[PDB]
Specification:
Keywords: Acetylation, Cytoplasm, Developmental protein, Differentiation, Disease variant, Emery-Dreifuss muscular dystrophy, Isopeptide bond, LIM domain, Metal-binding, Nucleus, Repeat, Ubl conjugation, Zinc, Zinc-finger. The protein is mainly β. The protein is built from 1 helix and 4 strands, in the order ββββα. The chain has a two-stranded antiparallel ribbon with strand order 1-2. A two-stranded antiparallel sheet has the order 3-4. The protein binds zinc ion (2 copies).
């Protein structure tokens, strides 16, 4: 997929770096930090529908992230015939 998984970490970092865009993230800005990593309120997207979730509630799965809805219809119950 992507040939470039070399460490070569940096001396130090005083800011939460992003994973989607790979751009340093700040506080004032709306983002989603989970277990360290942090995705900009706009970067944080779904894995199924692929829709910017952002601050909005979500459901992180094994090597993926399902937004509330997706998880609401995927796992959680719901009226199929509305
Ligand atoms: Zn980002
Ligand atoms: Zn979704």
């Amino acid at each position: 997929g992507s040939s470039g998984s070399s460490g070569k970490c940096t001396t130090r970092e005083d800011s939460p770096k992003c994973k989607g865009c790979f751009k340093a993230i700040v506080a004032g800005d709306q983002n989603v930090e989970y277990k360290g990593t942090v995705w900009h309120k706009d970067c944080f997207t779904c894995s199924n529908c692929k829709q910017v979730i952002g601050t909005g509630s979500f459901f992180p799965k094994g090597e993926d992230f399902y937004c509330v809805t997706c998880h609401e219809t995927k796992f959680a119950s719901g009226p199929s015939s509305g």
